Coordinates of N, CA and C in Angstrom, one line a residue:
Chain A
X1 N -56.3 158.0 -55.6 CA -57.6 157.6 -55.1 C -57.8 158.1 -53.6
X2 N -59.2 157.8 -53.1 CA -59.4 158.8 -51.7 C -60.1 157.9 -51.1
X3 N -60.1 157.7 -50.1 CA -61.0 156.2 -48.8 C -61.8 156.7 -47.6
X4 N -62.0 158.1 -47.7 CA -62.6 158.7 -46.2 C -64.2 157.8 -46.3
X5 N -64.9 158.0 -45.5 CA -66.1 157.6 -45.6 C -67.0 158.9 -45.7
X6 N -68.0 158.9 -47.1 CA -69.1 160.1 -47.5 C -70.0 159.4 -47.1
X7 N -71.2 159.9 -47.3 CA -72.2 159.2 -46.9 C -72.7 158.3 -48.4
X8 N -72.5 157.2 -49.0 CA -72.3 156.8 -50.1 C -73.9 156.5 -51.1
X9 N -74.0 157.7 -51.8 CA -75.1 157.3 -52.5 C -76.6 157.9 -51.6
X10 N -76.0 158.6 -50.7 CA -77.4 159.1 -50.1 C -78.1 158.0 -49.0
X11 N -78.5 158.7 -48.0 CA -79.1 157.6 -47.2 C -80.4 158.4 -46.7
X12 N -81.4 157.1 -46.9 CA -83.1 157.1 -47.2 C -83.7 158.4 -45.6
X13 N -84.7 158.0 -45.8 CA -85.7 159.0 -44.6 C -85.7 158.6 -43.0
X14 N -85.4 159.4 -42.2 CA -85.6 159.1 -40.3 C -86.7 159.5 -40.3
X15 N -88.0 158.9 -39.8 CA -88.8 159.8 -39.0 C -88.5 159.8 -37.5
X16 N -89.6 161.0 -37.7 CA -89.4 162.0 -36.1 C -91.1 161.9 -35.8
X17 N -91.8 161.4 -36.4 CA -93.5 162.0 -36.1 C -93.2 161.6 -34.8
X18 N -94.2 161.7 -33.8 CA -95.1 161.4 -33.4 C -96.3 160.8 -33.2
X19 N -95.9 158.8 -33.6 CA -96.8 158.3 -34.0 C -97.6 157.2 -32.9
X20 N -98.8 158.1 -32.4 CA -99.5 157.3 -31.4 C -101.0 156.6 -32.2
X21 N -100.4 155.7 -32.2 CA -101.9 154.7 -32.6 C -103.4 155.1 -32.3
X22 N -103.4 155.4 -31.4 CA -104.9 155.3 -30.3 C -105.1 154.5 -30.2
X23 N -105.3 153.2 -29.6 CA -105.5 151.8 -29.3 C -107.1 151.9 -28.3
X24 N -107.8 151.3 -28.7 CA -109.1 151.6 -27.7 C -110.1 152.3 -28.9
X25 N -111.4 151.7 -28.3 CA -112.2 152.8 -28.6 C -112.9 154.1 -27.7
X26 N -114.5 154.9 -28.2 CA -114.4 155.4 -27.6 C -115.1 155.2 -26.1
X27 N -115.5 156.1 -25.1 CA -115.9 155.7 -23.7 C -117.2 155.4 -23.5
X28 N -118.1 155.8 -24.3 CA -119.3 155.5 -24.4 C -119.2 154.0 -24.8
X29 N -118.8 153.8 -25.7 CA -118.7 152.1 -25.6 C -118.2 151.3 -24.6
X30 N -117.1 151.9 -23.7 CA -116.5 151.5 -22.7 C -117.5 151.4 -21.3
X31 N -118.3 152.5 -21.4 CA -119.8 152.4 -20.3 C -120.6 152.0 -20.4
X32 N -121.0 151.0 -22.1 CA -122.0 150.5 -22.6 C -121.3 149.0 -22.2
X33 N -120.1 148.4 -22.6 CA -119.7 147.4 -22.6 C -119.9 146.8 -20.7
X34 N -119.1 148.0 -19.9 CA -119.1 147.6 -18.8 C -120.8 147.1 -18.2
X35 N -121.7 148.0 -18.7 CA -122.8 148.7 -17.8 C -123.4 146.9 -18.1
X36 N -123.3 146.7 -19.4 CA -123.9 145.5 -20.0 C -123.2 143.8 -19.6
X37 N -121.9 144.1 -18.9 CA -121.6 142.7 -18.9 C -121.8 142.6 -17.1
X38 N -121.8 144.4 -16.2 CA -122.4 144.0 -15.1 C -123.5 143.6 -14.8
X39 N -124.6 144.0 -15.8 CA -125.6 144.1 -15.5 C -126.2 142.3 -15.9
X40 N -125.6 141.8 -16.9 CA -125.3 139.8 -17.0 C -125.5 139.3 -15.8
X41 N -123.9 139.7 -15.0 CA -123.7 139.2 -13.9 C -125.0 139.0 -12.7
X42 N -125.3 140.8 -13.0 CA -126.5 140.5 -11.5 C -128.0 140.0 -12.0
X43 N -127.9 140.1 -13.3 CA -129.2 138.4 -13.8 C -128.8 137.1 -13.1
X44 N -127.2 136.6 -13.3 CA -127.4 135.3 -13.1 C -126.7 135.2 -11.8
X45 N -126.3 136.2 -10.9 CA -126.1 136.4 -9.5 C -128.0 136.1 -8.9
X46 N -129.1 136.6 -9.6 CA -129.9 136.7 -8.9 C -131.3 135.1 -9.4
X47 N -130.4 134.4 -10.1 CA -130.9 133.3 -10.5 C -130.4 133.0 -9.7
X48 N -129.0 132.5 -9.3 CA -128.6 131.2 -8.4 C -128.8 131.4 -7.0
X49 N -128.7 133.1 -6.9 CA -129.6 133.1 -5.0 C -130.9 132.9 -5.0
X50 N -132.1 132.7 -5.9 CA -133.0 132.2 -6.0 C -133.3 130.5 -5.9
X51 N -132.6 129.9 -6.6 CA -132.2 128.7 -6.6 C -131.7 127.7 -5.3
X52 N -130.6 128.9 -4.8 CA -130.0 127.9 -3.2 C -131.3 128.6 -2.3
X53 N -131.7 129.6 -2.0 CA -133.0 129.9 -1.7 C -134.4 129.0 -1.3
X54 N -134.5 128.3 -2.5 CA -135.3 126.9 -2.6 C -134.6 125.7 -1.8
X55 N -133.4 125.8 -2.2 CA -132.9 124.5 -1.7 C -132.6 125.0 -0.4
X56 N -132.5 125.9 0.5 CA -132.4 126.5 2.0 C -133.7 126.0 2.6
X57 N -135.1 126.7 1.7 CA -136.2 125.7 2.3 C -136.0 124.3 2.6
X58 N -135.5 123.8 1.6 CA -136.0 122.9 1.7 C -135.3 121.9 2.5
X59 N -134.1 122.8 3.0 CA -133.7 122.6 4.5 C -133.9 122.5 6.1
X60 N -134.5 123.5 5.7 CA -135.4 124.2 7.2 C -136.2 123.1 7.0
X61 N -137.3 122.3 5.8 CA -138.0 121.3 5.9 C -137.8 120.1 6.5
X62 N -136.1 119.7 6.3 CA -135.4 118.7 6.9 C -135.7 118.8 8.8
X63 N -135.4 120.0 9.0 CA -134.7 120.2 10.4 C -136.6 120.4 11.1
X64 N -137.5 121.1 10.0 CA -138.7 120.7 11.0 C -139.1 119.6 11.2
X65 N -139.1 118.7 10.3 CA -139.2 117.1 10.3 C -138.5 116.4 11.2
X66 N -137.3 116.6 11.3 CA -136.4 115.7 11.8 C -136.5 116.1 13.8
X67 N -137.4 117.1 14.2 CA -136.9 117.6 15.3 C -137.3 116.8 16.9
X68 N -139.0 116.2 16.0 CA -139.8 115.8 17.7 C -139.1 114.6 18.1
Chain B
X1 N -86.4 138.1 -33.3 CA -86.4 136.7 -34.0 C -86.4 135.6 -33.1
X2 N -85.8 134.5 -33.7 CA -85.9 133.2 -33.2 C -87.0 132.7 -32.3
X3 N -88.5 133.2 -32.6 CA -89.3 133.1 -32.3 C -90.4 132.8 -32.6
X4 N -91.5 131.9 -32.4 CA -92.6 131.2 -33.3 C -93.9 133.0 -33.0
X5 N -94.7 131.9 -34.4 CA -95.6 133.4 -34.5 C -96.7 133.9 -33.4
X6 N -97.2 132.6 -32.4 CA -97.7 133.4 -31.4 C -97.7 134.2 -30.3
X7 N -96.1 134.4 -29.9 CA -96.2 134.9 -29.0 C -95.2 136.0 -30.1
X8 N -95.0 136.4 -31.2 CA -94.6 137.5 -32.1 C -96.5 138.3 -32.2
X9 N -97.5 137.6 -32.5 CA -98.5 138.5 -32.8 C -98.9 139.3 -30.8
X10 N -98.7 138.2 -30.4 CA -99.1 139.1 -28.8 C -97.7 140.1 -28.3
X11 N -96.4 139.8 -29.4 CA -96.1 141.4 -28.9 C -96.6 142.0 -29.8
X12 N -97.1 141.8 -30.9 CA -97.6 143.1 -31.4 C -98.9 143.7 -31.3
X13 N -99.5 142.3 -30.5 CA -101.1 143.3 -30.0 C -100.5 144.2 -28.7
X14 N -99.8 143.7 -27.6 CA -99.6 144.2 -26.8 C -99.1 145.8 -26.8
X15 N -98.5 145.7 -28.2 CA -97.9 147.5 -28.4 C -98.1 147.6 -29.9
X16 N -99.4 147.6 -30.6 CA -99.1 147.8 -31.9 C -98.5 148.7 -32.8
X17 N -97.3 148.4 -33.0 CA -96.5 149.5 -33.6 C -95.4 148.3 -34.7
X18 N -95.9 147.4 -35.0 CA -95.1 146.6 -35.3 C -93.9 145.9 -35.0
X19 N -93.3 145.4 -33.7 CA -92.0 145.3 -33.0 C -91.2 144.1 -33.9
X20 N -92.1 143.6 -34.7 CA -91.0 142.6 -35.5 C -90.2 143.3 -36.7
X21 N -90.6 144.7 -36.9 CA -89.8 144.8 -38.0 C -88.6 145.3 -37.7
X22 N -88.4 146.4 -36.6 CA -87.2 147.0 -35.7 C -87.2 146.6 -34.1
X23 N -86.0 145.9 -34.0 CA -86.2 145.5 -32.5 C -84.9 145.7 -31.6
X24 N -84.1 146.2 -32.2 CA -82.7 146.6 -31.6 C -82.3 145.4 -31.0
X25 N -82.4 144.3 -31.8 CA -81.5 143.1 -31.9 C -80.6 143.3 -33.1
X26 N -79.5 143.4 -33.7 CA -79.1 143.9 -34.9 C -78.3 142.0 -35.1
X27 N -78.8 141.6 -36.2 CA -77.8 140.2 -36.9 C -77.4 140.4 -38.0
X28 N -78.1 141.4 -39.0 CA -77.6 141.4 -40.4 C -76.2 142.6 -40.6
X29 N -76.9 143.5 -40.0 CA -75.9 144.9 -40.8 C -74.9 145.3 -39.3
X30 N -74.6 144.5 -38.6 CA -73.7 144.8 -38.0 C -72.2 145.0 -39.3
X31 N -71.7 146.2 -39.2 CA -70.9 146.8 -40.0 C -69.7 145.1 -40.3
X32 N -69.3 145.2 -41.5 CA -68.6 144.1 -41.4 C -67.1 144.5 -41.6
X33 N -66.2 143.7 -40.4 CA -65.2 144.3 -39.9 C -64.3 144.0 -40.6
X34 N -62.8 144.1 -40.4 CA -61.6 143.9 -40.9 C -61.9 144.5 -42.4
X35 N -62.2 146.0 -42.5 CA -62.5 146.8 -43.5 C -60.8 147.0 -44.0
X36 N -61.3 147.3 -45.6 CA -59.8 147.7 -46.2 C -59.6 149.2 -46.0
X37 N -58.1 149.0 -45.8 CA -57.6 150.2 -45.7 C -57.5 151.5 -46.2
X38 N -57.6 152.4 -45.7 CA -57.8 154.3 -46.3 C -56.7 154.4 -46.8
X39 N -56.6 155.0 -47.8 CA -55.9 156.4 -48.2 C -56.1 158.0 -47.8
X40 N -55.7 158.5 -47.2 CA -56.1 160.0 -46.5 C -55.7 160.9 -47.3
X41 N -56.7 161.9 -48.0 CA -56.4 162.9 -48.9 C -56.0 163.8 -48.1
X42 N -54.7 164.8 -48.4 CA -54.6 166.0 -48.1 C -55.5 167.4 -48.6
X43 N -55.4 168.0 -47.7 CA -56.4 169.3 -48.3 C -55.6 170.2 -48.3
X44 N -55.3 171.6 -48.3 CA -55.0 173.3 -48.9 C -53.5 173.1 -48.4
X45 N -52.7 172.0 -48.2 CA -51.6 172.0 -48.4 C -51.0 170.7 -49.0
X46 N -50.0 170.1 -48.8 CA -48.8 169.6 -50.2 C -49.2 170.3 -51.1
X47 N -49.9 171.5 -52.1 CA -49.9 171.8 -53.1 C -48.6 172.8 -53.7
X48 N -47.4 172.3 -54.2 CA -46.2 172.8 -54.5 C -45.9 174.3 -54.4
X49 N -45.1 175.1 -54.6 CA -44.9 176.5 -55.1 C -46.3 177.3 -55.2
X50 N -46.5 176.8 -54.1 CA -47.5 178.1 -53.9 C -47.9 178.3 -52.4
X51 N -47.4 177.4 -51.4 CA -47.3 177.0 -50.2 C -46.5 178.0 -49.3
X52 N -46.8 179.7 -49.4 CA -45.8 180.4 -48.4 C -46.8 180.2 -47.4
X53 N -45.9 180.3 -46.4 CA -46.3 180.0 -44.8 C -46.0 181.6 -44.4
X54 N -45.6 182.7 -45.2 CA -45.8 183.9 -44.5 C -47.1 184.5 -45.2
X55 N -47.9 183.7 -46.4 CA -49.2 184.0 -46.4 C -50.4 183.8 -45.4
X56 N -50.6 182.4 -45.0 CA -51.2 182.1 -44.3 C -50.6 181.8 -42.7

């Protein structure tokens, strides 16, 4: 009888690819996404400076009232 | 392994390539030791009367 080690019965497949996902889409959506979640921001950046705006008047209302 | 499934799916969003199936943690097929012993075949010699050494 003989005990070396063959490779016993064959052994399955290695790959080698080169396998890169792409993860992401493409950049047009990436400048559509951005353009659109800055462009959110300076809607409701330009509501709430509108808002303390009012309430600044209605400061300066305090301070002309309160002055003679 | 020894790991619950949400932070198993965030490594695999973080690198989708599937990291749970190969992770160069090895538990199962670490070769299993205290293997039985060889017998070592000889090759193109012990073969009797026909072994001159002023052939080869």
């Amino acid at each position: 009888v003989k005990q070396d080690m063959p490779p016993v019965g064959g052994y399955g497949p290695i790959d080698y690819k080169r396998n890169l996902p792409r993860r992401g889409l493409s950049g047009y959506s990436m400048f559509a996404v951005g353009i659109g979640a800055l462009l959110f921001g300076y809607w409701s950046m330009m509501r709430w400076n509108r808002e303390r705006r009012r309430l600044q008047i209605e400061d300066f209302e305090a301070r002309i009232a309160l002055m003679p | 392994a020894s790991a619950t499934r949400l932070i198993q799916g965030l490594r695999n969003w973080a690198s989708g390539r599937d990291l749970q199936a190969k992770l160069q943690l090895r538990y199962q097929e670490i070769s299993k030791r205290t293997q039985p012993p060889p017998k070592l075949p000889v090759g193109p010699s012990h073969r009797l009367s026909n072994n001159y050494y002023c052939a080869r």
